[PDB]
Amino acid sequence: SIDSAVATYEGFSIRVHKYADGDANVQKMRFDLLPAYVCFNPHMGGQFFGNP
Amino acid sequence: YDTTNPQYNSVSRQVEAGDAVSVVGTASQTMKPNLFYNKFFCGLGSIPLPKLHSIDSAVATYEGFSIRVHKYADGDANVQKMRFDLLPAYVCFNPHMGGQFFGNP
Numbered sequence: 001s002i003d004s005a006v007a008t009y010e011g012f013s014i015r016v017h018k019y020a021d022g023d024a025n026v027q028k029m030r031f032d033l034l035p036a037y038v039c040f041n042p043h044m045g046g047q048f049f050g051n052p
Numbered sequence: 053y054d055t056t057n058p059q060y061n062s063v064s065r066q067v068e069a070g071d072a073v074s075v076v077g078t079a080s081q082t083m084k085p086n087l088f089y090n091k092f093f094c095g096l097g098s099i100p101l102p103k104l105h106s107i108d109s110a111v112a113t114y115e116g117f118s119i120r121v122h123k124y125a126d127g128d129a130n131v132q133k134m135r136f137d138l139l140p141a142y143v144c145f146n147p148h149m150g151g152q153f154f155g156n157p
Contacts, residue, residue: 003106018105022124022133027105 062148089150095143 003018012033020027053066077083101120103109108123121136 001106020104020107022104022107022122022135025104029105 085152086154087150088153092145093150095145097141097143099139099141101137101139 004015006013006015008014014031014033016029016031018027018029053061053063098117100118103120104122110121110123112119112121117138119136119138121134124133125131126133
């Protein structure tokens with residue numbers, strides 16, 4: 001019962017919901033995304049710097 | 053009263069310091085004043101309201117004023133809600149075209 005749409009950018013998909021409170025006269029919008037992460041093997045990357 | 057643009061003078065002389073004034077009427081009395089005015093003394097209007105998201109509405113014209121209604125509910129309390137509303141706007145085009153009259157004793 002809430003108006004949506006879903007739009008791609010950089011090949012990531014994003015919902016918007018548009019609702020409102022009726023007793024207060026306000027209108028509200030939200031934009032969401034859920035990421036999932038993995039680290040397979042911590043020994044395969046790191047940080048680097050120059051050598052003095 | 054303007055020396056450099058006398059084309060705009062509304063009154064017959066300068067108001068200097070020390071000029072006697074007075075107040076029309078009695079001290080604490082309460083009354084209902086009558087009103088004369090020309091058509092272009094004061095203006096009146098109303099601003100159209102957009103509809104809230106995800107909430108049903110309708111718009112009806114009554115005297116020539118337009119009025120939104122919004123119809124929402126409370127799902128858990130199981131009640132039905134409605135509000136009708138309007139935004140007025142008011143102008144004073146010119147103070148010298150209207151006033152208040154009373155009788156003469």
